[PDB]
Amino acid sequence: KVFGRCELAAAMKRHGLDNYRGYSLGNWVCAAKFESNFNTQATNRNTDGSTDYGILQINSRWWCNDGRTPGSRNLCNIPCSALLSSDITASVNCAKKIVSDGNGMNAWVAWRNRCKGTDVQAWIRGCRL
Ligand SMILES: [Cl-]
Ligand SMILES: [Cl-]
Ligand SMILES: [Cl-]
Ligand SMILES: [Cl-]
Ligand SMILES: [Cl-]
Ligand SMILES: [Cl-]
Ligand SMILES: [Cl-]
Ligand code: NA
């Protein structure tokens, strides 16, 4: 599924991400824009052989099981394929665990490089939330 900007903002709010660990909804929408372009089916292989899955590009190295990432963990206790669903529940639940892990949204390198410190409220501007 390819979400619209306000459509995803609304879904993220419905699943309790807005202001989760103090990160306003525009931070989460900005992260999703640069990680996946709002596409739930986005996948990207990392040089180390791990893979990033879904709207928030969650990595098989730590967070999900894809059966092909040696020495990895599955801390969200999910198959990485669950992160590609049109329903964002599994991605949101796993993202809440990641952002609680100690470095907040810095875990998302695209958030640190493209969203951090910017006018992230622009991402929810005009949205009926
Ligand atoms: Cl957009
Ligand atoms: Cl915001
Ligand atoms: Cl594995
Ligand atoms: Cl594990
Ligand atoms: Cl599995
Ligand atoms: Cl959803
Ligand atoms: Cl933080
Ligand atoms: Na894994």
Curated annotation (Swiss-Prot):
- Domain C-type lysozyme spans what residues? 1-129
User: Which residues are annotated as active site?
Assistant: 35, 52
Gene Ontology MF terms:
beta-N-acetylglucosaminidase activity; identical protein binding; lysozyme activity
User: Taxonomically, which superkingdom?
Assistant: Eukaryota
Record keywords: Allergen, Antimicrobial, Bacteriolytic enzyme, Disulfide bond, Glycosidase, Hydrolase, Secreted, Signal
**Does the keyword Cell membrane feature in the UniProt annotation?**
no
The question of whether Disulfide bond is a record keyword is answered with yes
Q: What is its EC number?
A: 3.2.1.17
Q: Where does substrate bind?
A: 101
Which Gene Ontology cellular component terms are annotated?
cytoplasm; endoplasmic reticulum; extracellular space
Please cite one Gene Ontology biological process associated with this protein: defense response to Gram-positive bacterium
Q: Membrane-spanning regions, if any? A: none
Q: PROSITE patterns given for it?
A: GLYCOSYL_HYDROL_F22_1, GLYCOSYL_HYDROL_F22_2
Q: Which InterPro entries match?
A: Glyco_hydro_22, Glyco_hydro_22_CS, Glyco_hydro_22_lys, Lysozyme-like_dom_sf
- Catalytic activity annotation: Hydrolysis of (1->4)-beta-linkages between N-acetylmuramic acid and N-acetyl-D-glucosamine residues in a peptidoglycan and between N-acetyl-D-glucosamine residues in chitodextrins
User: What remark does the entry add?
Assistant: Lysozyme C is capable of both hydrolysis and transglycosylation; it also shows a slight esterase activity. It acts rapidly on both peptide-substituted and unsubstituted peptidoglycan, and slowly on chitin oligosaccharides.
What is the annotated role of this protein in its UniProt record?
Lysozymes have primarily a bacteriolytic function; those in tissues and body fluids are associated with the monocyte-macrophage system and enhance the activity of immunoagents. Has bacteriolytic activity against M.luteus.
Its quaternary structure?
A: Monomer.
- Family statement drawn from the similarity comment of this UniProt entry: Belongs to the glycosyl hydrolase 22 family.
Q: What name does this protein carry?
A: Lysozyme C
